[PDB]
């Protein structure tokens, strides 16, 4: 019985490879992607496979180096790139991985010598071989040999064709140290490229996640919010179990630090509460301002944030709570009594409240224009927002951009291949 | 990497040699450090006192790999002094020298179409490395490649001496002019 | 003989682009 599932599942690979070879000389990026997807969901599905991969065309380990040794190009690259899938999915985690990487190095040696149909199929499957490199790495430990090779290959990426997985791998190296490596992103700033094709469309969101992370490290919320939200927008797949929970944790903690108070009606996904409820507790504490409860929840949930690379952020928010609260008070009224606001925010005394308001004048909540007299706190929000002159630019340039984004049109009429 | 910038801030020729050692040892493993120290390295660029003054251009060329500016690599090679020829082949040195060679060919055609003379000669090291690579081709005995460089170089001297690539005159040596007829237009 | 291949590829490229601009102009004219 076991053979039958294998006997049905491990044969369509031959048809896919035949199609790949046939289109190789046709040339790629229009048929390869489907084969890559098939490879992926075969890998999730994963014996006699090493014997069946024996030299499909002529004109475990010994099975690995038997084919080429026997009667012997993109198809060869794909075969050399997918002999480690069995152990990969099985994740033997033994030295067999140390038996696998040489195949990767050999594949790396093979692909480097190739070159651009290779740059359109082998180049991208290079992405998944790098994924395996990192996996094989983290299994034992991080290493920059991959980093060195990637940096070298950046110039080639600068050649005719470019994949952007390399930026993702560099971010992987950064995060390996995590809170320790901060110069890496400093480099990534200048080294940043366009890669606007976004052909994978998953690497873009992936890198956006860690870009938001690094930006948040320096508390640059004004743009961190938007980048993190945009990243979350590009995640159609399920990616539920422990995959997007981290992204949500980062986004919500950043938002709470900025001053906005979210409510779980937003996400409340079934498969998040069990892991994200500590943030619910802390946000509930913050909205009120119960410092005692805040430290209670902090010391209770010492881990998670410590294990999620966000402990420092909450530790610093533990004093930004005051600004978080004052945002609402500044928003509501239009002429505040300094003493009254001091009482509301349980501040020390009038001079303390005045100083806090001044400190909060900076940028953000509408200007206070404190008069330092009976007027106390003015907080005179700008008016005339009525699509009139005052929102001349405000309600014109918005539409100007919203319409200049119509380049989707020109893209659409530049897309039609209309073969023959 | 902070040692790199910290050491460079120090002023001593031995300090410069130590910077040389570390930077040529690590070119891309630490890139933003040199990326920001571009100022110090380029001010050292022009200094007769610096024993390794040409090594400043060497640094420019080597560690501007991220800096895709082609002209940057061109001037880096021009100031390289000695190491440009030595770097026959490596990970990316071969790429930059090949780019320099193509740019030199472009300049040669550009200033050769100028027929009245007074053509601004290019930095000597550039044609030196061009001829060195021509010699490598002669060793490889790639007559077609050599003549192609000669014509794109717009220099009839290399075109003439390319006949020594194999010195048999079966075909191309005496019959590639037909190929030239087919694929050229400049009367 | 990669040199000849590159040369003919360049010739094809220039011919293709001139054809393209001509077609653009012709369509523009035909609109009127």
């Amino acid at each position: 019985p076991p053979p039958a599932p294998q006997d049905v599942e491990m044969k369509e690979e031959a048809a896919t490879g035949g199609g790949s070879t046939g289109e190789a000389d046709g040339a790629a990026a229009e048929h390869s992607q489907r084969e890559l997807d098939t490879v992926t969901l075969e890998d999730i599905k994963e014996g006699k496979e090493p014997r069946f991969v024996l030299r499909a065309l002529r004109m475990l380990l010994p099975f690995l180096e038997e084919p080429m040794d026997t009667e012997a190009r993109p198809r060869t690259g794909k075969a050399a790139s997918t002999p480690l899938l069995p152990e990969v999915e099985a994740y033997l985690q033994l030295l067999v991985v140390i038996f696998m990487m040489n195949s990767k190095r050999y594949k790396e040696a093979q692909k480097i010598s190739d070159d651009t149909q290779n740059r359109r199929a082998l180049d991208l499957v290079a992405a998944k071989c790098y994924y395996y490199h990192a996996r094989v790495y983290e299994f034992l430990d991080k290493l920059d040999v991959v980093r060195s090779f990637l940096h070298a290959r950046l110039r080639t990426a600068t050649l005719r064709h470019d994949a952007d997985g390399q930026a993702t791998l560099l971010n992987l190296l950064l995060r390996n140290y995590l809170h320790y490596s901060l110069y890496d992103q400093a480099e990534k700033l200048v080294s940043k490229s366009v890669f606007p094709e976004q052909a994978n469309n998953n690497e873009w969101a992936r890198y956006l996640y860690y870009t938001g992370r690094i930006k948040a490290i320096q508390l640059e919320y004004s743009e961190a919010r938007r980048t993190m939200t945009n990243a979350l927008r590009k995640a159609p797949q399920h990616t539920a179990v422990g995959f997007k929970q981290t992204v949500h944790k980062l986004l919500i903690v950043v938002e709470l630090l900025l001053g906005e108070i979210p409510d779980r009606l937003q996400f409340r996904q079934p498969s998040l509460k069990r892991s994200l409820m500590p943030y619910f507790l802390l946000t509930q504490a913050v909205r009120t301002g119960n410092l005692a409860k805040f430290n209670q929840v902090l010391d209770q949930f010492g881990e998670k944030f410590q294990a999620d690379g966000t402990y420092t952020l909450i530790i610093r928010l533990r004093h930004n709570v005051i600004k978080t609260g004052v945002r609402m008070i500044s928003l509501s009224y239009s002429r505040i009594s300094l003493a009254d606001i001091a009482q509301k925010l349980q501040l020390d005394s009038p001079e303390d409240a005045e100083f806090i308001v001044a400190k909060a004048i900076r940028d953000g909540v509408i200007e206070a224009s404190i008069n330092h007299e009976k007027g106390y706190v003015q907080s005179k929000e700008m008016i005339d927002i009525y699509s009139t002159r005052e929102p001349q630019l405000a309600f014109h340039q918005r539409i100007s951009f919203c319409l200049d984004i119509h380049n989707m049109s020109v893209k659409a009429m530049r897309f039609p291949p209309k073969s023959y | 990497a902070a040692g790199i910038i910290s050491l460079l801030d120090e002023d001593e020729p031995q300090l410069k040699e130590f910077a040389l050692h570390k930077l040529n040892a690590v070119v891309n493993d630490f890139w933003a450090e040199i990326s920001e120290s571009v100022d110090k390295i380029e001010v050292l660029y022009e200094d007769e006192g610096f024993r390794s003054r040409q090594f400043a251009a060497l640094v420019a060329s080597k560690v501007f790999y991220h800096l895709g500016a082609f002209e940057e690599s061109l001037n880096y090679a021009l100031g390289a002094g000695d190491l440009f020829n030595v770097n026959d082949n490596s990970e990316y040195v071969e790429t930059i020298i090949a780019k320099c060679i193509d740019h030199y060919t472009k300049q040669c055609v550009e200033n050769a179409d100028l027929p009245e003379g007074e053509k601004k000669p290019i930095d000597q090291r550039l044609e030196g490395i061009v001829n060195k690579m021509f010699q490598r081709c002669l060793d490889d005995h790639k007559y077609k490649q050599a003549i192609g460089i000669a014509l794109e170089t717009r220099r009839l001297d290399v075109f003439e001496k390319t006949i020594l690539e194999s010195n048999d005159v079966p075909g191309m040596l005496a019959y590639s002019l037909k190929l030239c007829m087919s694929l050229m237009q400049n009367k | 003989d990669l040199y000849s291949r590159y040369k003919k590829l360049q010739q094809e490229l220039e011919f293709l682009e001139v054809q393209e601009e001509y077609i653009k102009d012709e369509q523009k004219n035909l609109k009127k």
């Binding site: 005719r160 039609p416 209309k418 023959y420 | 490889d140 | 590829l9 490229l13 077609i23 369509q27």
Partner: peptide, 30 residues
């Protein structure tokens, strides 16, 4: 065997997408 003379060919072949552009505009003209 300088690679200078074996990269421009790949460059032009990649650029040939102008062929597909010509096809589409020819379709419009037709």
């Amino acid at each position: 065997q300088y690679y200078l003379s074996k990269i421009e060919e790949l460059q032009l072949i990649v650029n040939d997408k102008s062929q597909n552009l010509r096809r589409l505009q020819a379709q419009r003209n037709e």
